[PDB]
Amino acid sequence: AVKIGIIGGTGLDDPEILEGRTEKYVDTPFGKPSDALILGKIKNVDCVLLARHGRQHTIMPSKVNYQANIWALKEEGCTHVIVTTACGSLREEIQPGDIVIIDQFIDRTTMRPQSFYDGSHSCARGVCHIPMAEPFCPKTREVLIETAKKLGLRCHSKGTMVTIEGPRFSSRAESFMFRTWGADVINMTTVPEVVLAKEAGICYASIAMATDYDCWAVSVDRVLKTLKENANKAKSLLLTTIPQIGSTEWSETLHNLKNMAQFSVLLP
Amino acid sequence: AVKIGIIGGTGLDDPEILEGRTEKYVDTPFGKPSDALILGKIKNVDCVLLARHGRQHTIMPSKVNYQANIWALKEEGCTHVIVTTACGSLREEIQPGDIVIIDQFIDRTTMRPQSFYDGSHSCARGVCHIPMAEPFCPKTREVLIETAKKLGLRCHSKGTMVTIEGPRFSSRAESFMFRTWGADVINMTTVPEVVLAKEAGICYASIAMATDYDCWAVSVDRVLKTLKENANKAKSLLLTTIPQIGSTEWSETLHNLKNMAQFSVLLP
Amino acid sequence: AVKIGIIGGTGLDDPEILEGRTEKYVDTPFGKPSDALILGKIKNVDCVLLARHGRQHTIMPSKVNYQANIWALKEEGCTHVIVTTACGSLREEIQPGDIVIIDQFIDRTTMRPQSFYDGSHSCARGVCHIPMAEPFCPKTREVLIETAKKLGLRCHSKGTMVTIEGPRFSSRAESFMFRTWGADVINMTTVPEVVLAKEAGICYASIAMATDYDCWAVSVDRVLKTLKENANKAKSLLLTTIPQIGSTEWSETLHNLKNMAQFSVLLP
Ligand SMILES: Nc1ncnc2c([C@@H]3O[C@H](CO)[C@@H](O)[C@H]3O)n[nH]c12
Ligand SMILES: Nc1ncnc2c([C@@H]3O[C@H](CO)[C@@H](O)[C@H]3O)n[nH]c12
Ligand SMILES: Nc1ncnc2c([C@@H]3O[C@H](CO)[C@@H](O)[C@H]3O)n[nH]c12
């Protein structure tokens, strides 16, 4: 049995995606999640939807409580967490409207807690050095890629996301630099979301939707405009991918993730 | 009508630059500015001078209240903000004593608020994603460049400033690395000063004075020594540039900046 | 007369290394050190041992009070500070088990105070811009290198340490990137430890022990396993190096360090 947590990004968090919906506000040892959890289903698969920036989008990337969001989904029983995020393209071949099933990231954030084990919560004691060689779940990414193919969607099978602190967009000099570092797309929320999901032993995958070419011309209006035009893609991908995940066995994948997380903790 | 805000850097904030001076201490929703605002004129142009590190230079780069400084200048009616800053040269052709009218930056700071919209001030509500493709005002930079030419000063027409957190200087390994990233000069205060000026809809330009070659030998004494020897250059440049700015029309430039800033804000 | 402060890293802080031991808990203007100071000797040389993460290793890298640790050693009279640290190798020639007498660093940390002069302690007033061209003491590194040679140990004479914030390990994309930046080894504690030692006018050197190849496969268990197998090397190196340091004259070296630190401070 699996339960899919879904974190929706800017203009990519439509509750209508789930049937038999029920709102549920929760609390965690790390504070309150961005907004209430929406419990529902996609076919016969249990899901939990959460708006990363709050349903009215009032939380900037730097201020999102990533710890609470991941902890709440974990506490709810989620075995998987698939998210959506807008991003700028740092590669000509990645055109706005394209989906990128990212497999790597480059951290450029500075003021964000990246671990549950901060030595101040009973629920998570000790020091945790979580491995990040493969930040995203390969099995989940695989089904997303195949499903995108079945839907005839322009989709890139891999990509490195550079996550900046924000809220400002990058300067042109930074944009060029990120390209030399091997970054393919850029956003403000992948890190530490992917890191905390790992510590929680959750299969995490990200559906990145290119909304602009950054500036190597990006603006809020341009991003919102592209998201509005392409939101249906991520929705369709999730609706078709989730039932597939629910039809396969994950016991082993989840076991290996649990072990990796457990053995990354150093106790007193 | 224009009003020029001038933020003076280390040993580059001489109040004598303005005539008909008047001291004015102010407060802002983000706290107190580094020091009192000095109101005065350069020819027929109204100006507002502010010492970035306080008149006695007691504030380290990491601790400068960039938000309050920019907000105070904005509240005072400034349409432009031209600043001075010492910096290390990362390029052989940029010799100590040379002026660099920077046009780009690379952020390496880590503990600095970079937006007025931090969701805790009525004066600035919502989330702001300010564009940084062109961080500095091209029209202002243009007049600075031409004026430097008329003054016969060694001046570089462009350059990328890498702003480090400090207060320590860079290691040699970092110095070499910055060069590979395309950085031309290095300092500790350009970011987030330039970013906040943008959010405020202000035309911002920076007069960077190379004071050393970093270490790709830099020391406090070396920087102070070079600044003392070349301070007159920035003063003369400002005195000659400002009247020129006041003689041209900026209504359109300021309108486009206001629009960019306004449309970068996402309301609830 | 010299006094060697020794900061022991993960599984590299054996108090048995000193004879005539005496435990001593202290306080500093910056708070409490990671654990009690252990006073003792190695031959005829006075030493002070301190466990970076606490004797039970309960402090994550981001939370170590580097200021208090360095200040306590300084207050105790230490002229030198030699430390041990595990690290990942970013170079094929640097094999796990190898020692690296690092000479440079690249900062990737984000939430760490890096100066004693934060404008809130009487003991350190003003603004300090400490030079970092040569972060590590060349004379101390020289004796460590020669001693390693006399012990027949695989030892690299130089290397650039990239210090990440942690507590998570790097992603593969970050690992590759660090290699392009010229980094040779990677850890989570060199910065700001080396910076604060410099401000304190202390000769600082680091004995880096490669424990893995990062991921360009690293895990907590792998690191602990390698450290357990090679801990004896760092211990032997320290035991043999320290008496040599005590047999030479450092008055001039220490004088130049004191001057550099003193002249890096800007008073009101
Ligand atoms: N070129 C770009 N650079 C950085 N972030 C973004 C984004 C993402 O969309 C939002 C900003 O418009 C924010 O959540 C960020 O993660 N779209 N395009 C971007
Ligand atoms: N090589 C260098 N690296 C970093 N900052 C500076 C500076 C600037 O001058 C001051 C330090 O001396 C500080 O305000 C910083 O922005 N001059 N030379 C520098
Ligand atoms: N590949 C690697 N990356 C980052 N840090 C480390 C370390 C160091 O060892 C500890 C983590 O296992 C921590 O103190 C860190 O500084 N070993 N291997 C590492």
Contact A132 C169 (CB under 8 A): yes
β-strand pairing of A155-156 with A99-100: parallel
Classify each residue of C163-174 as buried b or exposed e, where b means 16 or more C-beta atoms within 10 Å of its C-beta. bbbbbbbbbbbb
Contact C106 B177 (CB under 8 A): yes
Query: Residue of the nearest CA to atom 7 in ligand 1?
Result: A87
Question: What range defines the domain where residue C249 resides?
Answer: 1-268
β-strand pairing of B104-108 with B160-164: parallel
Q: Which two tokens stand for residue A203?
A: 């299969």
For A56, the closest of B110, B132, B268 (CB atoms) is B268
Contact C129 B220 (CB under 8 A): yes
Using a CB-CB cut-off of 8 Å, the residues of chain C touching A183 are 173
Please check whether residue C254 is in contact with residue C197, taking contact to mean a CB–CB distance below 8 angstroms.
no
Q: After which residues is chain C broken (C to N over 2.5 A)?
A: 216
CA distance C66 to C115: 10
C111 secondary structure, DSSP code? S
Which residue, B208, B122, B230, B90, is CA-closest to B157? B208
Distance B188 CA to ligand 2 centre (A): 6
> In which region does residue A232 sit, left (phi positive, over 0), alpha (psi from -120 to 50) or beta (all else)?
alpha
Contact C220 A263 (CB under 8 A): yes
For C264, the closest of B171, B174, B219 (CB atoms) is B219
Please check whether residue C163 is in contact with residue C190, taking contact to mean a CB–CB distance below 8 angstroms.
yes
CA distance C165 to C192: 11
- Closest alpha carbon within chain C to A106: C174
Please check whether residue B21 is in contact with residue B15, taking contact to mean a CB–CB distance below 8 angstroms.
yes
Resolution of the entry in angstroms: 2.0
Can you give the CATH number for the domain in which A182 is found? 3.40.50.1580
C263 touches chain B (CB under 8 A): yes
> In which region does residue C67 sit, left (phi positive, over 0), alpha (psi from -120 to 50) or beta (all else)?
alpha
- Closest alpha carbon within chain A to B183: A173
Classify each residue of A36-68 as buried b or exposed e, where b means 16 or more C-beta atoms within 10 Å of its C-beta. bbbbbbbeebbbbbbbbbbeebbbbbbbbbbbb
Please check whether residue B200 is in contact with residue B261, taking contact to mean a CB–CB distance below 8 angstroms.
yes
Contact C171 A107 (CB under 8 A): yes
Classify each residue of B216-252 as buried b or exposed e, where b means 16 or more C-beta atoms within 10 Å of its C-beta. bebbbebbeebbeebbebbbebbebbbeebbeeebee
- Closest alpha carbon within chain B to C109: B110
Of the residues A53, A108, A171, the best mutation for testing chain B's interface (the one with the most B CB atoms within 10 Å of its CB) is A171
Please check whether residue A264 is in contact with residue C219, taking contact to mean a CB–CB distance below 8 angstroms.
yes
Which residue, B201, B200, B204, B193, is CA-closest to B245? B204
Q: How many CB atoms lie within 10 A of CB C150?
A: 12
Question: In sequence order, which residues have a C-beta less than 8 Å from that of residue C27 and are 6 or more positions away?
Answer: none
A134 touches chain C (CB under 8 A): yes
Q: Which two tokens stand for residue C220?
A: 């907590």
Which residue, B134, B123, B29, B140, is CA-closest to B78? B140
- Helix, coil or strand: residue B128: strand
Of the residues A108, A127, A204, the best mutation for testing chain C's interface (the one with the most C CB atoms within 10 Å of its CB) is A127
- Closest alpha carbon within chain B to C195: B168
Question: From the CA of C181, how many Å to the nearest CA of chain B?
Answer: 6
Question: From the CA of C176, how many Å to the nearest CA of chain A?
Answer: 9
Is there a catalytic annotation at residue A212?
A: yes
CA dihedral A231→A234→A236→A241, nearest 10 degrees, is -170
CA distance B261 to B264: 5
Q: How many CB atoms lie within 10 A of CB A173?
A: 26
Residue C223, ligand 3, Cβ within 6 A: yes
Written in H, E and C, the secondary structure of C171-229 is EHHHHHHHHHCCCCEEECCHHHHHHHHHHCCCEEEEEEEEEECCCCCCCHHHHHHHHHH
Question: In sequence order, which residues have a C-beta less than 8 Å from that of residue C166 and are 6 or more positions away?
Answer: A129, C60, C61, C62, C188
CA distance C240 to A130: 36
Q: Which two tokens stand for residue A247?
A: 């039809």
Contact C134 B218 (CB under 8 A): no
C127 touches chain B (CB under 8 A): yes
Of the residues A70, A117, A129, the best mutation for testing chain C's interface (the one with the most C CB atoms within 10 Å of its CB) is A129
Please check whether residue B218 is in contact with residue B133, taking contact to mean a CB–CB distance below 8 angstroms.
no
> Where does ligand 1 bind, in terms of residues with CB under 6 Å?
A 10, 61, 85-88, 164, 169-170, 186-189, 211-212, 214, 218, 220, 223; B 129
Paired with B5 in beta bridges are: B48, B81
Distance C187 CA to ligand 3 centre (A): 5
B69 touches chain A (CB under 8 A): no
Phi/psi at A69 (5° precision): -60, -50
Using a CB-CB cut-off of 8 Å, the residues of chain C touching B169 are 129-133
Question: From the CA of A225, how many Å to the nearest CA of chain C?
Answer: 31
Please check whether residue A70 is in contact with residue A203, taking contact to mean a CB–CB distance below 8 angstroms.
no
Measured at the alpha carbon of residue A43, what is the angle toward residues A25 and A251, in degrees to the nearest 5?
A: 80
Please check whether residue C91 is in contact with residue C215, taking contact to mean a CB–CB distance below 8 angstroms.
no
B25 touches chain A (CB under 8 A): no
User: What is the total count of domains within chain A?
Assistant: 1
CA distance B214 to C91: 28
CA distance B133 to B103: 10
Contact B168 C134 (CB under 8 A): no
Paired with A107 in beta bridges are: A163
For B182, the closest of A169, A176, A223 (CB atoms) is A176
What is the residue whose two structure tokens read 């603006």? A219
Active site residues of B: 212, 214
Cα-only R_g, chain C: 17
The alpha helices in chain A, defined as continuous H runs, are 66-75, 138-150, 172-180, 190-199, 220-246, 251-262
Distance A163 CA to ligand 1 centre (A): 9
B49 secondary structure, DSSP code? E
Q: Which two tokens stand for residue B119?
A: 């969701």
Which residue, A195, A172, A216, A28, is CA-closest to A109? A195
Q: Experimentally, how was this structure solved? A: X-ray
A106 touches chain B (CB under 8 A): no
CA distance C61 to C192: 11
Question: From the CA of C148, how many Å to the nearest CA of chain B?
Answer: 25
Which residue, C133, C99, C112, is CA-closest to C230? C99
CA distance C179 to C94: 13
Which residue, C14, C157, C232, C189, is CA-closest to C88? C189
- Helix, coil or strand: residue A250: coil
B167 touches chain C (CB under 8 A): yes
CA distance C186 to C182: 11
Distance C197 CA to ligand 2 centre (A): 21
User: Residue B91 annotated as binding?
Assistant: no
For C182, the closest of B110, B169, B177 (CB atoms) is B177
Instruction: Please provide the distance, in angstroms rounded to a whole number, between the alpha carbons at the two ends of chain C.
Output: 35
CA distance C104 to C133: 8
Contact B115 A167 (CB under 8 A): yes
- Closest alpha carbon within chain C to B63: C118
CA distance A112 to A64: 9
Atom of ligand 2 at shortest range from CA of B215: 1
For C263, the closest of B167, B173, B219 (CB atoms) is B219
Burial of B139 (0-12, 13-18, 19+ CB in 10 A): middle
What's the maximum distance between 2 C-alpha atoms anywhere in chain A?
A: 52
Paired with C250 in beta bridges are: none
C264 touches chain B (CB under 8 A): yes
- Helix, coil or strand: residue C91: coil
Paired with A7 in beta bridges are: A50, A83
Question: From the CA of B262, how many Å to the nearest CA of chain C?
Answer: 31
Length of chain A: 268
For B215, the closest of C109, C117, C133 (CB atoms) is C133
Using a CB-CB cut-off of 8 Å, the residues of chain A touching C167 are 114-115, 117, 127-130
